[PDB]
Every structure is written in C-alpha cells, then in structure tokens.
Design a protein around this ligand. Structure first.
Ligand SMILES: Cc1cn([C@H]2C[C@H](OP(=O)(O)O)[C@@H](COP(=O)(O)O)O2)c(=O)[nH]c1=O
Ligand SMILES: [Ca+2]
Length: 129
C-alpha cells in the first residue's frame, strides 16, 4: 500500500470527506470505520473531530487498500492521513467510530483498528461510555 498526496476541499461528517484527488473533487469514505450520522449520539462529536484533524493538517494523504477502491456511490475507499496520523485509527481510538464493514478485500489495517477499538472500549470512551 502507498500513500498518495491529496488536498482537503471539505470535511463532510465523521467518516466522509471531500478531497482534490487526481485534479478532481472526489468524496472519500474512510475504510473500516463507521461514525454515527450527525443526527445520532456522538455524530456531531465524530464530525467535529474529523473536521479539526483534516482542516488543521499541513499534509493530507490517501492510501487505497488492496481491494475495491470505490463504493457503489462513487466514494473513494481509503485510509486517510493527516500529517502521518491515520484519521480512521484516531477516530476509533477516540471512541468516536466503530470498526465496520470489513470486506471486498480491504482489511490491511483491520487489526490495528480493532486494537484501537478495544482500548477505547476498555476506557469506556464516548460511544462506549
Ligand atoms: C466503508 C464502506 C462503506 N460501503 C457502503 C456500504 C453501505 O452501503 P448501503 O448504504 O448501500 O448499505 C454504506 C455505508 O456507508 P455510510 O456509513 O457512509 O452510509 O456504504 C462500502 O460498500 N464499502 C466500504 O468499505
Ligand atoms: Ca457513517
């Protein structure tokens, strides 16, 4: 897997962001995580966390996994990094997303994220409180 540069256009919610990738605006959906919808508990906090992380970053990178690269809605499926820190991981570690979906061959970081989720759950953080 390799990191590719991208530019933030707009943070949408906890697990969806809009980036300039290959000269076009593209929606990206974070691999292996599920934040609550903004209309649900911790949804607004999950939105806020992702927004700050990506808006404050000097460098955004996208890393596609080895499986399918877009969902049925045209959204890129990637791990996103802000100054080398994975947003997917940071959200799970903060108890603001659950580990989820896990399919179409995109599981490279599954263990890393499950380890993060267990620690958030052990700390009874946010979603787990
Ligand atoms: C994260 C992810 C979501 N999705 C799809 C599955 C769900 O489809 P359906 O809505 O058709 O059931 C939806 C959930 O994402 P959201 O939580 O952004 O809604 O996006 C994938 O197909 N692959 C993925 O890796
Ligand atoms: Ca979601």
């Amino acid at each position: 897997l390799h990191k590719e540069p991208a530019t933030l256009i707009k943070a949408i919610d906890g697990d969806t962001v809009k980036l300039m990738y290959k000269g076009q605006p593209m929606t990206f959906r974070l691999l292996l995580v599920d934040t609550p919808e903004f209309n649900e508990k911790y949804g607004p906090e999950a939105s806020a966390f992702t927004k700050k992380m990506v808006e404050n970053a000097k460098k955004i990178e996208v890393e596609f996994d080895k499986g399918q690269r877009t969902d049925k809605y045209g959204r890129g499926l990637a791990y996103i990094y802000a100054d080398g820190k994975m947003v997917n991981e940071a959200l799970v570690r903060q108890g603001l997303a659950k580990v989820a979906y896990v399919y179409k061959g995109n599981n490279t970081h599954e263990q890393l994220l499950r380890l993060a989720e267990a620690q958030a759950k052990k700390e009874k953080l946010n979603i787990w409180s």
